[PDB]
Amino acid sequence: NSPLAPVGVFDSGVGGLTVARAIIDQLPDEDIVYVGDTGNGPYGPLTIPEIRAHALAIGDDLVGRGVKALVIACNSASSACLRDARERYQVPVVEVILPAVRRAVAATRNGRIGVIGTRATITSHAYQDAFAAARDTEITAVACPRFVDFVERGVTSGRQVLGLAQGYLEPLQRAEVDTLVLGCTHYPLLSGLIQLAMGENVTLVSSAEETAKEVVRVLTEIDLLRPHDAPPATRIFEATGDPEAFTKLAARFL
Amino acid sequence: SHMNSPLAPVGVFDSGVGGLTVARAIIDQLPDEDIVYVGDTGNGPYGPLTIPEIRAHALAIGDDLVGRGVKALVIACNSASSACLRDARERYQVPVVEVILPAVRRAVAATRNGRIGVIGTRATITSHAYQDAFAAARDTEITAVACPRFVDFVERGVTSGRQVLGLAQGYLEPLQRAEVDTLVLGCTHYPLLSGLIQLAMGENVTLVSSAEETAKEVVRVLTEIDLLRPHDAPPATRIFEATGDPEAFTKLAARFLGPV
Numbered sequence: 001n002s003p004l005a006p007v008g009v010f011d012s013g014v015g016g017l018t019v020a021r022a023i024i025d026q027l028p029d030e031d032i033v034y035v036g037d038t039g040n041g042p043y044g045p046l047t048i049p050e051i052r053a054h055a056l057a058i059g060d061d062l063v064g065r066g067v068k069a070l071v072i073a074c075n076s077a078s079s080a081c082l083r084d085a086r087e088r089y090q091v092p093v094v095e096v097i098l099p100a101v102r103r104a105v106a107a108t109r110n111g112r113i114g115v116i117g118t119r120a121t122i123t124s125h126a127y128q129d130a131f132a133a134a135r136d137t138e139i140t141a142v143a144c145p146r147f148v149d150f151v152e153r154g155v156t157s158g159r160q161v162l163g164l165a166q167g168y169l170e171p172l173q174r175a176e177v178d179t180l181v182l183g184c185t186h187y188p189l190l191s192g193l194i195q196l197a198m199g200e201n202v203t204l205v206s207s208a209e210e211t212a213k214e215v216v217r218v219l220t221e222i223d224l225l226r227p228h229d230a231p232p233a234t235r236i237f238e239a240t241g242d243p244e245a246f247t248k249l250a251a252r253f254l
Numbered sequence: 255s256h257m258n259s260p261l262a263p264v265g266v267f268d269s270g271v272g273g274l275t276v277a278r279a280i281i282d283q284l285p286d287e288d289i290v291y292v293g294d295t296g297n298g299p300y301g302p303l304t305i306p307e308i309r310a311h312a313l314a315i316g317d318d319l320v321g322r323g324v325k326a327l328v329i330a331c332n333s334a335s336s337a338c339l340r341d342a343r344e345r346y347q348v349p350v351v352e353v354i355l356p357a358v359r360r361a362v363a364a365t366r367n368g369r370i371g372v373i374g375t376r377a378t379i380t381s382h383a384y385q386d387a388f389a390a391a392r393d394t395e396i397t398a399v400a401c402p403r404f405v406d407f408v409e410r411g412v413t414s415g416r417q418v419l420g421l422a423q424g425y426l427e428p429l430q431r432a433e434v435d436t437l438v439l440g441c442t443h444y445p446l447l448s449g450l451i452q453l454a455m456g457e458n459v460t461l462v463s464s465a466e467e468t469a470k471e472v473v474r475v476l477t478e479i480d481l482l483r484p485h486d487a488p489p490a491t492r493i494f495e496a497t498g499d500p501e502a503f504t505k506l507a508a509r510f511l512g513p514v
């Protein structure tokens with residue numbers, strides 16, 4: 001398309017703002033259209049065909065509006081629909097699983113890699129299968145279903161949530177992982193808590209951070225960066241559910 | 255006072271507006287902590303100053319924050335930590351967290367080939383604070399490079415494209431030749447270049463964010479001393495102050511806080 005076209009970003013809800021904020025941090029001149037599917041999410045407890053239906057509806061709307069690139073900020077939606085998206089859209093698609101996978105394989109020292117995410121992300125085996133091409137690595141994947149509710153309620157330090165994480169992460173500790181993928185939009189807000197649980201030696205990998213660096217790479221190489229001397233960037237935020245409820249909760253992630 | 259009340263605020267200070275990346279990362283982790291942030295826009299940038307000039311500026315702000323009763327002090331500025339951390343250990347009795355040591359410990363743990371790079375202001379690099387802090391790390395080789403233009407590039411919003419890539423390829427060339435696989439972003443502004451730097455350094459280089467590691471340290475410190483502000487306390491208060499022009503601080507802060 002045109003370098004002046006927006007970047008589309010979408011998510012199951014409000015937590016994908018961690019990805020959007022990281023993209024905007026790296027790319028202050030890009031126009032952005034963010035859509036959070038608060039009308040139909042959370043995607044965490046849904047089935048894969050349910051998630052794909054919801055995500056592709058938003059994907060089709062954003063591509064229909066002329067975005068030059070589509071970013072799937074939700075790890076659950078990335079599991080359910082990257083296959084479809086590759087073939088369905090002609091714009092480049094960035095998502096949140098593969099940039100982290102590549103970072104984790106480069107960052108590990110003993111080859112033992114963990115990943116945490118929603119039930120739907122972990123049950124899909126997107127991470128387990130994506131890591132199968134990595135020589136000399138052992139993957140341990142664990143769903144952490146209550147993490148999302150604790151992040152949104154703002155309860156991310158202290159004894160209650162620390163015990164919750166110790167119970168979730170025990171298999172990763174037992175497996176002696178030295179690298180841990182935060183495979184969910186909400187989990188960067190728990191990186192201090194998770195690091196305390198896992199100890200100093202474990203490298204945490206943020207989906208938001210790696211994906212934003214990948215958007216920089218992708219727009220640079222296909223020569224579609226919106227120019228610095230273009231007008232001030234426009235950033236549009238839309239919700240499929242209650243816009244006022246979205247605005248209230250977004251303060252937690254912005 | 256080692257131990258103030260858990261209801262006391264956390265003090266964060268910086269040479270100006272760039273330390274908001276550290277304060278935002280702290281607030282991300284710790285939504286129920288009261289924050290007082292002071293950014294020394296009236297005397298910055300610290301990057302081109304001497305160590306004694308930086309120290310005197312920074313301690314004047316630490317003195318204010320401590321006198322307000324903060325329960326912990328975060329030196330968010332890598333130039334300032336280089337110049338005054340030593341003084342702050344004796345001058346202040348509340349816990350002091352800063353941005354050099356957490357990233358050093360991370361870098362030591364994250365490297366695979368033992369080759370570690372660090373970039374920062376001229377003051378930070380020529381102080382040898384990173385070179386000396388790494389001396390205890392056996393089987394490591396440190397390469398340190400000052401990147402003086404990175405700060406104004408970040409602040410004026412120019413962080414991708416050919417111009418800033420060519421500028422970054424020139425700075426980072428010694429690190430590529432040294433074959434580092436780990437790079438400490440030893441400056442407050444550099445997280446806003448991490449995509450540009452990752453692109454110049456290749457995919458095998460692990461970038462280490464001062465903001466991120468220091469925020470995780472604050473979570474750990476407050477937890478282990480049991481000084482976390484409780485979730486059922488009133489909503490957290492977050493004060494941001496500038497020693498220089500208030501309207502310029504607000505305009506520049508937009509770059510580091512992100513969309514409203």
Ligand SMILES: N[C@H](CCC(=O)O)C(=O)O
Nearest residue numbers: 012042043044075076185
């Ligand atoms: N955005 C989702 C988390 C919230 C949800 O379950 O909808 C994810 O990254 O997996």
Ligand SMILES: N[C@H](CCC(=O)O)C(=O)O
Nearest residue numbers: 269299300301332333442
């Ligand atoms: N805060 C400074 C960058 C800006 C300045 O030079 O004052 C640092 O982290 O080194």
